[PDB]
RNA sequence: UCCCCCGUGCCCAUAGCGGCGUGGAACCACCCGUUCCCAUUCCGAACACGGAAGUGAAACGCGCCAGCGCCGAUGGUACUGGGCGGGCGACCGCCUGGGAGAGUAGGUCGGUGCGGGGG
RNA sequence: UUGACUGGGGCGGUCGCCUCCUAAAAGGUAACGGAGGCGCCCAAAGGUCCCCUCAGGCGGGACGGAAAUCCGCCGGAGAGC
RNA sequence: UGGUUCUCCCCGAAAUGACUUUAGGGUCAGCCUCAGGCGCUGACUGGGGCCUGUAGAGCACUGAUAGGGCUAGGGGGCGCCUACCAAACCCUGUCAAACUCCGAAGGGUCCCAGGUGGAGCCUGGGAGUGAGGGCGCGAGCGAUAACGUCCGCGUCCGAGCGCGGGAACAACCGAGACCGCCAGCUAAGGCCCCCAAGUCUGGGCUAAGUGGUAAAGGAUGUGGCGCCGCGAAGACAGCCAGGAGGUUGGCUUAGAAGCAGCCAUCCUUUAAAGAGUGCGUAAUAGCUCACUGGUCGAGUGGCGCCGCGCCGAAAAUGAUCGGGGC
């Protein structure tokens, strides 16, 4: 909700930023293919997330739209598009961890995310943890 | 703080860096671009009287001869906090003018 | 724990990676060497050992060095280690993260609400001769309210917390 | 030769901040005064002149400390001149040279020419 | 005589100059691509010499906002131009 | 706009910039050719010296950001209090063409060298071009549409619709055609026949005619590797038999007393342990193991990456991988 905007499409090269690590939560949802995820999609996932286990734990959505997706009105050529119209999106490079759950069973957690994946226009993978950290 | 550096505005080589203490005044001829000093004329770190101004002169005469001796003349004055006033080198010899 | 650490000569990191090895490096104010292990090896150890407990490497020539893993790198696409820097311990007081355990069950069940491991394990200055396995968290008397952090831990001897102190190390929050 | 100190330049934070004791014989400063020179939109605060009684408390100088700051490898990757495969495509990969940024180990409370005064 | 551009023409918009970006680490670089200015102003807002150093933040202060003016620390530039 | 007449030889473009009542026209520059003149200075390469601000990356400024912490202020009863509704501020995570603490490869230029080339440089005569196009890589516009559209570096076509391959086919792969030969070696791609040259020699995979070019998403389709159980505390499949007692605790009980729904997850006690996964109505009342003996005496259940394949798969004149046929 700010700054001067209606920006350049730009492209998604290798996913040099497609691969973080569960930061909070317990289990997670990492992306396999690069893409633009419409807020419309995030919610549509998150919602079903919470909704899968009514009155459950916590949901963390690390990805976040901010890129304005413009579009023409159904005509020809003459200056950038009315822009936005539908809205904004976030850019996901294969490997980024989109959503992550916690405070619940793996049977409940794992199965929860699985659904989300159906909402997102990508191919996903689910992860656990115990991996990366900065301890000794 | 005083960022004076009234100097720094010295481009024509040869600097007559002065320095007034609270009893003794020191003057010094320096070559920049090649950091080194040549002529020197302190106040009491020399000897002479005990009167600032009075001294401030006989202390400059010092630089005169001393300098001229090794082929020095045209130069520019100096010292930043200086405040061109009491302390003085109003003396013959050096073509530093003033 | 322990596991062979075969000396890295210095040729084709991928060659390893791909072959079966796992480039690494061991160092301290004194030592600094190129090493390599084996996925299945390192994994089987770290997966459980991580970097909370001591690791001793068996160099092909007698050597038996006390160490810890300061950092491991990942190949973004499909998390798989790429490199590893080993901290060859000795005696000087050293820094390191030590695990924490949240036992019991703080109020947060009637209406729900679950905690949030705000700092699974923390770093505290300590001398090697003493290296606590994991530390305890006597929290269970706080609801959606506040949370604990910094000096709210029975940090045993030689455990001068090495943080702020102020790092919120835990917190309980509402459900969905 | 090696110490101490007053001027100065250079490197341009590894010399910084903040702590901790020290130095007054010399230097330096603060001090002693406002008659003269000259002073502050009002103040000798600062500029300035004349004096040296008192002081090292300020300020500066010199040491020690790592808590902040600054520096910071090696490894390893990202990316990449050039060359080149796979797949329908979206994209993935190799060969040959180059090679960070972050982060780790760790380093640092300076270094160094010139001229002076003192043992 | 009743202009040109123009993802046909008309309608619409535009037409010179300045500044970012696009622009792919020398320059230069398109599109009816993204985004803003100019068609003036200073007789001091110009010379030179000599001085001073900001904005903020924190306390403390009669009237006094949440910055009127004062005093005290901190603040290398985020003010000014 | 159309037309422009004999022959051979040599070199050979351009479809860009600027200004144009200019936009299918023109002037100058750029690229071409000829003459003369200067002679190693050319392209490209090696070694040095600076310039740079992209790719990556990073939040130190500009902004944006999810969660927690702390906390001016601001709602709600109103003092205490209460969910980040929420300023700054600190963490944890991040994002950016018009952000940068940082920063490559690379590019530009100067010097010293290499480099005799249809290289260069100077002057002058003659031009044409100023309608490009495809492909690859980097970006805009588009819809991460177009044989779309604009630029940037390169290339090929243009002018190489001359030659080999790709079934056919300007620009994809190979390669720059003075001419002749019933000579040889090789490119690409090929070697079952049409159709030149292996039905060549090992080692594996696939049974769809896949190969013979469709996606999310699906399935004990196959073949090869891995980790967790756990099997004389000898069931993994038939199979016998109990199908335990306070369990029949919660709103709603009209009924939860698993076999309504939100609150439990203790106990008694052993065949063992259902805090009950399951066919129901009015609960309840019955059924099978989710546990255990007898024989039976052996590999069985649970997840996961890899190779190939399968479902997902509907269009119009007769069909087919170029065909035959594998």
Swiss-Prot record, chain A:
Pfam families: Ribosomal_L16
GO cellular component: cytosolic large ribosomal subunit
Keywords from the named record: Ribonucleoprotein, Ribosomal protein, RNA-binding, rRNA-binding, tRNA-binding
CDD domains membership: Ribosomal_L16_L10e (cd01433)
Keyword Lyase: no
Keyword Ribonucleoprotein: yes
Entries under InterPro entries matching the protein: Ribosomal_uL16, Ribosomal_uL16_bact-type, Ribosomal_uL16_dom, Ribosomal_uL16_sf
Molecular function terms from GO: rRNA binding; structural constituent of ribosome; tRNA binding
One GO BP: translation
Similarity-based family: Belongs to the universal ribosomal protein uL16 family.
Description of how the protein assembles with itself and partners: Part of the 50S ribosomal subunit.
Function per UniProt: This protein binds directly to 23S rRNA. Interacts with the A site tRNA.
PANTHER family on file: 50S/60S RIBOSOMAL PROTEIN L16 (PTHR12220), LARGE RIBOSOMAL SUBUNIT PROTEIN UL16M (PTHR12220:SF13)
Protein name stated in the entry: Large ribosomal subunit protein uL16
Organism lineage: Bacteria, Thermotogati, Deinococcota, Deinococci, Thermales
Gene: rplP
Curated annotation (Swiss-Prot), chain B:
Keyword Repeat applies: no
GO cellular component: cytosolic large ribosomal subunit
GO BP: any one term: translation
InterPro entries referenced in this protein's UniProt entry, alphabetically: Ribosomal_uL18_bac-type (IPR004389), Ribosomal_uL18_bac/euk (IPR005484)
GO molecular function, one term: 5S rRNA binding
UniProt entry keywords in alphabetical sequence: Ribonucleoprotein, Ribosomal protein, RNA-binding, rRNA-binding
UniProt family annotation: Belongs to the universal ribosomal protein uL18 family.
HAMAP family attached to this UniProt entry: Ribosomal_uL18_B (MF_01337_B)
Name of the protein: Large ribosomal subunit protein uL18
Organism of derivation: Thermus thermophilus (strain ATCC 27634 / DSM 579 / HB8)
Lineage: Bacteria, Thermotogati, Deinococcota, Deinococci, Thermales
Gene: rplR
Swiss-Prot record, chain C:
BP GO terms, sorted: translation
InterPro entries per UniProt: Rbsml_bL25/Gln-tRNA_synth_N, Ribosomal_bL25/Gln-tRNA_synth, Ribosomal_bL25_b-dom, Ribosomal_bL25_C, Ribosomal_bL25_long, Ribosomal_L25_dom, Ribosomal_uL5_bac-type
Alphabetical list of Pfam families matching this protein: Ribosomal_L25p (PF01386), Ribosomal_TL5_C (PF14693)
GO CC terms in record: cytosolic large ribosomal subunit
Domain of life the protein comes from: Bacteria
Molecular-function GO term, any one: 5S rRNA binding
Keywords for this protein: Ribonucleoprotein, Ribosomal protein, RNA-binding, rRNA-binding
Claim: DNA damage is one of the keywords in the record: no
PANTHER family to which the protein is assigned, alphabetical: RIBOSOMAL PROTEIN L25/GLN-TRNA SYNTHETASE, ANTI-CODON-BINDING DOMAIN-CONTAINING PROTEIN, RIBOSOMAL PROTEIN L25_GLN-TRNA SYNTHETASE, ANTI-CODON-BINDING DOMAIN-CONTAINING PROTEIN
Subunit structure: Part of the 50S ribosomal subunit. Contacts the 5S rRNA; has been isolated in a complex with 5S rRNA and uL5, 5S rRNA and DNA binding protein II; 5S rRNA and uL18; 5S rRNA, uL5 and DNA binding protein II.
Family recorded in the similarity comment: Belongs to the bacterial ribosomal protein bL25 family. CTC subfamily.
Function according to Swiss-Prot or TrEMBL: This is one of 3 proteins that mediate the attachment of the 5S rRNA onto the large ribosomal subunit.
Name of the protein described by the UniProt record: Large ribosomal subunit protein bL25
Species the sequence originates in: Thermus thermophilus (strain ATCC 27634 / DSM 579 / HB8)
């Amino acid at each position: 909700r700010m700054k001067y905007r209606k920006q350049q499409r730009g492209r998604l090269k290798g996913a040099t930023k497609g691969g973080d690590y569960v930061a909070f939560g317990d289990y997670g949802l990492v992306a396999l293919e690069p893409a633009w995820i419409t807020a419309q999609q995030i919610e549509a996932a998150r919602v079903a997330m919470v909704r899968h286990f009514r009155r459950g734990g916590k949901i963390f959505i690390r990805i976040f739209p901010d890129k304005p997706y413009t579009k023409k009105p159904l005509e020809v050529r003459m200056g950038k598009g009315k822009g936005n119209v539908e809205g904004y999106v976030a850019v996901v490079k294969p490997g980024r961890v989109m959503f992550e759950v916690a405070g619940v069973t793996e049977e409940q957690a794992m199965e929860a995310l699985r659904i989300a994946g159906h909402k997102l226009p990508i191919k996903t993978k689910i992860v656990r943890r115990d991996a990366y950290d900065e301890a000794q | 703080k005083f960022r004076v550096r009234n100097r720094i505005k010295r481009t024509g080589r040869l600097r007559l860096s002065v320095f007034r203490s609270l009893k003794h005044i020191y003057a010094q001829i320096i070559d920049d671009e090649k950091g080194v000093t040549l002529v020197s004329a302190s106040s009491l770190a020399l000897k002479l009287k005990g009167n600032k101004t009075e001294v401030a002169r006989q202390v400059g005469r010092a630089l005169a001869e001393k300098a001229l001796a090794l082929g020095i003349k045209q130069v520019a004055f100096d010292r930043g906090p200086y405040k061109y006033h009491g302390r003085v080198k109003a003396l013959a010899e050096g073509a530093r003018e003033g | 724990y322990r596991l062979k650490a075969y000396y890295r000569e210095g040729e084709k990191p991928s060659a390893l990676r791909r072959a079966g090895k796992l480039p690494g490096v061991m160092y301290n104010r004194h030592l600094n060497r190129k090493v390599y292990v084996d996925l299945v090896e390192f994994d089987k150890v770290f997966r459980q050992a991580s970097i909370h407990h001591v690791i001793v490497l068996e160099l092909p020539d007698g050597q038996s060095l006390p160490t810890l893993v300061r950092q491991v790198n990942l190949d973004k696409r499909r998390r798989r280690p790429e490199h590893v820097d080993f901290f060859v311990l000795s005696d000087e007081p050293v820094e390191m993260y030590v695990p924490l355990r949240f036992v019991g069950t703080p109020a947060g069940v009637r209406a729900g609400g679950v905690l949030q491991e705000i700092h699974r394990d923390i770093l505290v200055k300590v001398s090697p001769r003493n290296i606590p396995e994991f530390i305890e968290v006597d929290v269970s008397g706080l609801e959606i309210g506040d949370s604990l952090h910094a000096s709210d831990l029975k940090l045993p001897p030689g455990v001068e917390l090495a943080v702020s102190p102020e790092e919120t190390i835990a917190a309980v929050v509402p459900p969905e």
